[PDB]
Assembly symmetry: C3
Homo-oligomer: 450 residues x 3
Amino acid sequence: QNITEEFYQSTCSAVSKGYLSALRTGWYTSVITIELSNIKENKCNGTDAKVKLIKQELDKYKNAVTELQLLMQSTPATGGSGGSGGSAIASGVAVCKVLHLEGEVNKIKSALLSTNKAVVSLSNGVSVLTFKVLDLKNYIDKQLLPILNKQSCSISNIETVIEFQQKNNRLLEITREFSVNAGVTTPVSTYMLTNSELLSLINDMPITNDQKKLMSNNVQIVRQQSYSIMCIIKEEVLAYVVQLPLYGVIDTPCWKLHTSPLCTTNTKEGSNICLTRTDRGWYCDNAGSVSFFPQAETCKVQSNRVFCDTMNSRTLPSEVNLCNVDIFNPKYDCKIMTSKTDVSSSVITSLGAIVSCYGKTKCTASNKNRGIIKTFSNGCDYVSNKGVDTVSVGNTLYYVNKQEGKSLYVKGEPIINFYDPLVFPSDEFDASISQVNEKINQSLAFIRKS
Amino acid sequence: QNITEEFYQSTCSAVSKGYLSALRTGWYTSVITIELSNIKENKCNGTDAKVKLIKQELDKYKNAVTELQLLMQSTPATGGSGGSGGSAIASGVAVCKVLHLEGEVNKIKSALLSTNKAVVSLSNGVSVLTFKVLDLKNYIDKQLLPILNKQSCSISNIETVIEFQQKNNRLLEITREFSVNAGVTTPVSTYMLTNSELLSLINDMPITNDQKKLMSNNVQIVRQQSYSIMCIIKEEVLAYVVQLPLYGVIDTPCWKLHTSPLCTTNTKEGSNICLTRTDRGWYCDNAGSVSFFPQAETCKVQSNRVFCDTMNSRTLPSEVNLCNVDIFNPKYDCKIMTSKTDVSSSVITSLGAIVSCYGKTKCTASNKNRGIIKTFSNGCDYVSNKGVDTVSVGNTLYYVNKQEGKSLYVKGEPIINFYDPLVFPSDEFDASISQVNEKINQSLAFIRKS
Amino acid sequence: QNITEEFYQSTCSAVSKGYLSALRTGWYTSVITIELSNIKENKCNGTDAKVKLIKQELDKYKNAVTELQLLMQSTPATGGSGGSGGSAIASGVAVCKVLHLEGEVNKIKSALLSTNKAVVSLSNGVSVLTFKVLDLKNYIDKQLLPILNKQSCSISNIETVIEFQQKNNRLLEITREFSVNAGVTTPVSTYMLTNSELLSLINDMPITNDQKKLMSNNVQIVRQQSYSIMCIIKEEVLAYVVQLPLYGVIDTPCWKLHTSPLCTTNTKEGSNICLTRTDRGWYCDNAGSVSFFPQAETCKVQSNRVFCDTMNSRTLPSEVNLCNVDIFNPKYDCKIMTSKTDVSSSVITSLGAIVSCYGKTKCTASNKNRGIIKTFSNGCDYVSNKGVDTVSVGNTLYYVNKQEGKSLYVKGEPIINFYDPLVFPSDEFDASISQVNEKINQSLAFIRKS
């Protein structure tokens, strides 16, 4: 919706509010089928130039079928070591394992006899929406076979060769993508499922009309957060599972936390201590708690809405937001790391830029027609994106976002000035406020008595 | 083979045994050649529609040849900065450098005159298996040239255009893959080497029949662990090196170590200390030592066999396995890291799941038809995958593996309860058992005397 | 130019000198256009086999146009969260936003009426070089429309179908690449901009003739460091921005720093302390300071010249090079990390190899015809690449570079021997020389008085 931003001068951090959530909590498994033809290379004294082209494409069709056949034994055998990869495709893997039953292929075979798509109830109680997106069996048996399976193969047609190359192309590219990916691809490509097929797949999913609108206006993100698992190739059918994300958390407030090192600015470069707020990234309200995503690369932002996968998240108490308003609060122990690294750096936020300027570094903010409009002093500062297009830190040039929104500069004393440098734990990798004050109380006790 | 798993309650870790090794220790370099035709665009008043299509494809053929020509000067000039990338392709780079000798191209030119494949002994003593996978020279000189190199270009045939587009397509895609990858691609694509060519290449390699069976049943993994280096384009031949992995360690025991944070469970959230075993990942017996792979992403698991590259490994003493049976043993100094991070998390193993439940986090294990079957208490626990399909930690839902195997719950007192929190080094990034006990003895000496 | 290397035995580090800089400081935005035809599927009793092929390709053309149309609304809405991704494409995003003005498309429409390329001055004062690389509008309206828009569709030509599939192929692949990448692709593919178009684009850019030579001889690197942003599809034109890098720092000295752990070699494995120089990677002189690139993967080396992006850099004082000649100098506080991790490892440099051999590890350097020529003792050592091709550490085999250059073995006492192990801070994650000596002075004060 409307994006706001608050910069906290005391902790060298900023929070971008106003975002809406779209967190994946479920999966929908669809069975995409390709009707195939099994045939044998028949001896024929092929002498017609159109015959040689058909023979070459039939070999490419058979080679694909053969590779897939090898791959059918590997896709259930791949993995098993555990981890995040196996847990992400377990819903689809469970469907692939059911399609290995004798009954099961026939059942989707019978449901797709009259229609291209139909809902099938599998033996494991999973109701899947089955698609038939390519019918190579009917094309090979109706056009290629009568033209080929006579004693004189010289009969042919030039438009039949071009059309067969057109239809067979998708099978070769689906084979190619499944070949180098051991049967599990992500994102789901157009060869794996076209946009018209995906939009038709979304419209028939057992989801609300609001979720149909959401997934149809964010197809690119839906494809990225989806998996395609190769299942089987038996009985004249090629079947693979397309695993679509289900967003069980929608329209809850999200916010992104930006952090930058906060150091003292003494002239003596060796007497400077630093601290940095940890756990930067996306936060979203979720089921009375907060879903925290440490790797912001796992979330996708599309028009002020944040698409994330819950498997890449940590569940934190709602009191974690207190670190943005009062980092010394006792409800939640806010985490910081310490250093003596007085190296300048910048962080482009949603509506501005944080600048940690230290040493002799030249840190400015410029407008391309007006020039330098702000010069950052030693320490941690912030500039809005209004009237600014460039931030320069040292030899590197950053560009601010030109998005609309209000920024609030929350003035405050930098908390690094509250610590005695002679007693400050300078190299804490993953500490907290109470942790640092605990060590400081330990060291201040030995000196006070002796 | 048969997978087992032991969970160590005392150290919040689990080991998955029963895997077999396939570690890459060598390389095999093959020279893949493409016979090319050098020609000049001849003036011709092309007025026949089939002529324009031939002219367009000839330009695409020439453009490719030209780009490759630029790329021939860059592939030996690329890199040189050192590191893992240069060491991985050094065998192939050494072959590319020999193909720049005047004699050398001719030598593979003469060996492939009568056959598509032949073994050639290069000047640097390397015996390579050379393939001729595409003969564009013979097709352009036998079909395109007689039809084109007459005063009347209007002679043409429609099947000749389609067949030339078919043959020339591989050269354009090989050119395209080498173009954006600076001449070094991985995995090796089907355009670079088809499956039938690779299976034929494996069957003629100077390896044992057991290794031929291994590489033929794991083609996808073989392709992934292979490199393709562009060598040269001179004298009517395009030559590039395909670098296949050689597995010198086979069928030795491998095991995967899973770790999770182990914390105390006091009601006061600030008085809790944590430790976590480091060096999670794959371990494999190798030449009297243990090959440890810190980045488990570098290994590929296929039906209980672990394919890894030794360049992504560390060589550890065999006593490193003592950390799984007795972490306080003096033979090997087991490594741990310390924190006060009481954040809940789960680890999906091969046969179960480790759960580190802390704070107010809701941690359960469920069956989709039976419901919640186990509720994890505060601390580090474990559940088998038998009868379980779901583990829920906070707002995130994990899926267990449904693989077959026996799990053993090794009961034991959590070792974190043995440490006095007032003297525990809380923020050790990469310490060890004796390191922590060393610091504790240092601090306990100052207080005992005064 | 000519590469040299110095190994510092005292600090277990090496510097590779002699490289030349090519650092990206600017961007050039070009507007690549594709003239499109908007049409409606006209009712026609298509019965001619060539008609069905035209109808199938027209649907693929329309489907692409439709997807792009969805994508036009998403590319300005994608992102906005800030960070490095938004700052990299801000120049192109600013051009895409101007092309949404009513006047603007027409203006590039009028400039490309007579020529394929022309310079256009946009309303935002940006002078862009506009290309027209594909004219599907003229082909559909001149060939497909007269053949299709008669009452008898049965008129057709077979070469028209093949040529339409050829022209339409680029639009489908441009659509495909923009589809899965949310409108921002990198590197820029051949479909997005061919090599002949890029070379012609470089030759007409407002840059010096020396920079035209540089970018033309390093096209692969130029493509990698470029972005393609989808802009708009309105008014019969498809327009996207190709963002080319501008190298504002050229031919300044660069050098690469290699580091490896430096430990004591006591027989008792628990009494060993270690230190490691941090901030390994590329350094380049830049504007009186030094541009440091922590992630060496962000730089590309081509024939002794280092292409890097300044956005992936830190700006350091020129005194940072003093850590290579005197790590105890007071001008710059050299950074180190400490450990007790006596695990062996090797680092392949530009002209040799650093070996940190500890414990029982077998560390050798071999020649494939002569055998083992050097055996590394406990500690940190180095070998040149002259006469050496293999370094073996434990079970892993590294290959040295065969590049030409002089190596200098700077003998010196390892600085780890200067520290008392009983007072050494063993687990410092990101400390420095003065930091370690500061803690040592703190601990040596308590014991000396009592």
